Design a protein around this ligand. Structure first.
Ligand code: MN
Length: 155
């Protein structure tokens, strides 16, 4: 509905897989809600999905949200894969579970509850908020306190 909100999100990881973190800022009429956490072993992709997911789920009513992120991964999937998955039953052409299906589905459910406008940022053109989120993410990744139970260990 109405009620405007601005969300900034970033994800960080030290390896692949390695300790990682996310950072997100929920802003409404000047007020800011900050989010972040570190995980002992995760991926950059998953943190980037986790940042968007946490912020959105923090919303308790239909909102017009402008989602700002530097993630190429999140971008490709919102504009290139999400549609095919939905029509293919969250399965890859050759019928087979997509990577991070747990987070993509949960993020898609998150997006459904609001009218979203994506603001993709490239290189040095992101706002000051996109960098606070990066500091939060990198800080969390250096002091992880949680396990990413949904990550299928690939190594
Ligand atoms: Mn980043």
């Amino acid at each position: 509905m109405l009620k405007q909100v601005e969300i900034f999100t970033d994800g960080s990881c030290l390896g692949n897989p390695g300790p990682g973190g996310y950072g997100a800022i929920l802003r409404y009429r000047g007020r800011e809600k900050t989010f972040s956490a570190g995980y002992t072993r995760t991926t950059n992709n998953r943190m980037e999905l986790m940042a968007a997911i946490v912020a959105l789920e923090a919303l308790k009513e239909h909102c017009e949200v402008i989602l700002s992120t530097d993630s190429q991964y999140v971008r490709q999937g919102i504009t290139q894969w999400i549609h095919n998955w939905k029509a293919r039953g969250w399965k890859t052409a050759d019928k087979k579970p997509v990577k991070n299906v747990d987070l993509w589905q949960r993020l898609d459910a998150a997006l459904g509850q609001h009218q979203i406008k994506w603001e993709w940022v490239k290189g040095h053109a992101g706002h000051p908020e996109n960098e606070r989120c990066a500091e939060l993410a990198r800080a969390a990744a250096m002091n992880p306190t949680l396990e990413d139970t949904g990550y299928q260990v690939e190594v």
